[PDB]
Each structure stands twice: as structure tokens, then as C-alpha cells.
Design a protein around this ligand. Structure first.
Ligand SMILES: CN1CCC[C@@H](O/N=C/c2ccc(C(=N)N)cc2)C1
Ligand SMILES: [Ca+2]
Length: 223
């Protein structure tokens, strides 16, 4: 996260870190056994880390649970990033309390102008590279589809939306991938892609989660 703020320990209780020896992606806990992330975060040997603040220090509220299976969206295209969404099942159910909690799926799509909270342990610099140890947060509005398409000609599908600031300086970044965009207590987006980070006229592009609620529910129901 570039241009954001320190969230505060366990203030984002649905935020997970995906770990394969090191943090490599965020995700969102949607029930005791399932995490939603980006398909571009797919890899084998994922351990899900819940209750994290400092990802380099054991602080007392962590749950580390290995993934038993990953399900990349059937229509994911890694070249265009269309359908950039993946489900991860935990080997055992997480213990849910105030610091580790699921986030609700949306029942309808959000609108341009809605304020959302974007979070993760990604790069904090728009030019260089600095990775934080504690969770960073950014409040950002959903942008109109027209301005999103204008920023990224020929690249924005019906399964994507832009959020952030066309002036630059405030954005998600590398390492935030797969993490949440939460708007009025609903998971509306997943950190997907962008040109660099926090660049002028290049806002963050997010997977449009409301399009996938049917698929998520039916997948969970049978797996
Ligand atoms: C570190 N890796 C490995 C995975 C592939 C790629 O992930 N990049 C994600 C990204 C980039 C930019 C933005 C943004 N500006 N909002 C948001 C997300 C680079
Ligand atoms: Ca920790």
C-alpha cells in the first residue's frame, strides 16, 4: 500500500497473509474454512496466516493453517487477468473471535463513489521498494467505469473495477495482490493489477467480487 496508514493490529480481522516460506499475497477470510484471493496468487504449498499484524513477529493472535485445496476460477485468463479470483480451503476451520473474523460477500455490486478500505503488506513506495512488516490500510473511492476504461484503454472487462486516486500517490501495490477491498462491510474487490503503483492516471484495478458470489457459494457448497 502506497500513501496509506498503519491499520492497527487486528483491526482488519478478515485480512490473511498467504505464506510459502514468506508472505507473497493477501486474501480475505469469508468463512471458517475458506479464503478468497486472486488467481494470480495461485501456487502450491500455501499456508494461510490469520490474525497477523507484524508478519515477521509472532505477536499472540496468529492462526497458521495449511491450505487443503485451491480452486482458480474456471475462466481465469493470466494474460488479461480476466476473472482474477481464487478460492482456498483451509485444512482445519479457523477459530473465529474479534481479531479473526470472516467478511460478508456482497448481495449487490457497489457504485462509483463508494468509499472502501484496501489493505495489505505490499510495497509502500511508488518508485523504490520498501515492504512494511505491519498491515497497511488505504481508504479509497470506487471510480466510474468510464474513467477506469479511459485510464486503461482496451483492458478493463466487466469483471474489473478501478478504485483510488487519478492524481496518484495513493494505491495498492506489489505484495497487496489478492487482498481485500471492503465497502460498507462487504467484500467488493480483490487487489488484481495496475500500471506501476500510485502513478498519475493509473489507479488500482480490482476483481469485481459481486460477479462471483454465485460461483463462490456453489463452490463452497460442494467442496
Ligand atoms: C509482485 N508481483 C508478483 C505477482 C504479479 C505482480 O502483481 N502485481 C500486483 C499489483 C500491481 C499494481 C497494483 C496497483 N497499482 N494497484 C496492484 C497489484 C507482481
Ligand atoms: Ca505476526
Amino acid at each position: 500500500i502506497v500513501g496509506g496508514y498503519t491499520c492497527g493490529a487486528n483491526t482488519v480481522p478478515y485480512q490473511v497473509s498467504l505464506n510459502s516460506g514468506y508472505h507473497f499475497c493477501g486474501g480475505s477470510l469469508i468463512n471458517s474454512q475458506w479464503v478468497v484471493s486472486a488467481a494470480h496468487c495461485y501456487k502450491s504449498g500455501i499456508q494461510v496466516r490469520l490474525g497477523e499484524d507484524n508478519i515477521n513477529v509472532v505477536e499472540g493472535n496468529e492462526q497458521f493453517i495449511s491450505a487443503s485445496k485451491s480452486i482458480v476460477h474456471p475462466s481465469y485468463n493470466s494474460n488479461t487477468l480476466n476473472n482474477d479470483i481464487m478460492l482456498i480451503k483451509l485444512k482445519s476451520a479457523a477459530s473465529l473471535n474479534s481479531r479473526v473474523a470472516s467478511i460478508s460477500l456482497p448481495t449487490s455490486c457497489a457504485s462509483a463513489g463508494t468509499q472502501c478500505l484496501i489493505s495489505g503488506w505490499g510495497n509502500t513506495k511508488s518508485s523504490g521498494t520498501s515492504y512494511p512488516d505491519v498491515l497497511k490500510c488505504l481508504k479509497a473511492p470506487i471510480l466510474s467505469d468510464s474513467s477506469c476504461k479511459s485510464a486503461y484503454p482496451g483492458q478493463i472487462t466487466s469483471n474489473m473495477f478501478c478504485a483510488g486516486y487519478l492524481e496518484g500517490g495513493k494505491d495498492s501495490c506489489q505484495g497487496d495482490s489478492g487482498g481485500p477491498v471492503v465497502c460498507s462491510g462487504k467484500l467488493q474487490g480483490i487487489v488484481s493489477w495496475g500500471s506501476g503503483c500510485a502513478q498519475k492516471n493509473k489507479p488500482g484495478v480490482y476483481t469485481k467480487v459481486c460477479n462471483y458470489v454465485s460461483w463462490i457459494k456453489q463452490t463452497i457448497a460442494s467442496n
